[PDB]
Amino acid sequence: ERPRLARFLADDIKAQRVAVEDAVDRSVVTIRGDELFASASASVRDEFQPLLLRIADALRKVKGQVLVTGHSDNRPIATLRYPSNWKLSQARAQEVADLLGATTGDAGRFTAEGRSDTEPVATNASAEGRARNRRVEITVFAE
């Protein structure tokens, strides 16, 4: 009934690569951007794809709809491809959704939204706080 993912992500939780909230109606996997993407990029580094693969494996077992929200800090590293923190946050969420959709083969199950710096979980006044704000939150709803 209740979507529960922590049980499938023990190693990543212990290594502090992800955090998982198993809530009443959702499981939310928070992943710092640094665990997936190079600085200022929305491509999941080859070396870190296995982390998303473990999430895909878990999502095969808990067949709820999935929302991916992307978040930035308030200190943009603007580039040609991502001219704002908003665009980077959207692109990061969308890349995660796209990769998970392709691996599960569930078309329409994953959607994405970029939320830029509007939903911090930490201060932006330290480097470590900014690194916590740059993140995706992957929400799986009840099956």
- Residue whose token pair is 């040609």: 80
Q: Which domain holds residue 121?
A: 1-143
Sorted by sequence, the CB contacts under 8 Å of residue 16 that are 6+ apart come out as none
Using CA atoms, how far residue 37 sits from 74, 93, 103, in Å, is: 17, 11, 18
Number of domains in the chain: 1
C-alpha span between 142 and 98 (Å, rounded): 21
* Local structure of 82: helix, strand or coil: coil
Give me the resolution in angstroms, 1 decimal.
Answer: 1.5
CATH number of residue 126's parent domain: 3.30.1330.60
Residue 23 amino acid letter = A
Identify the experimental approach.
Answer: X-ray
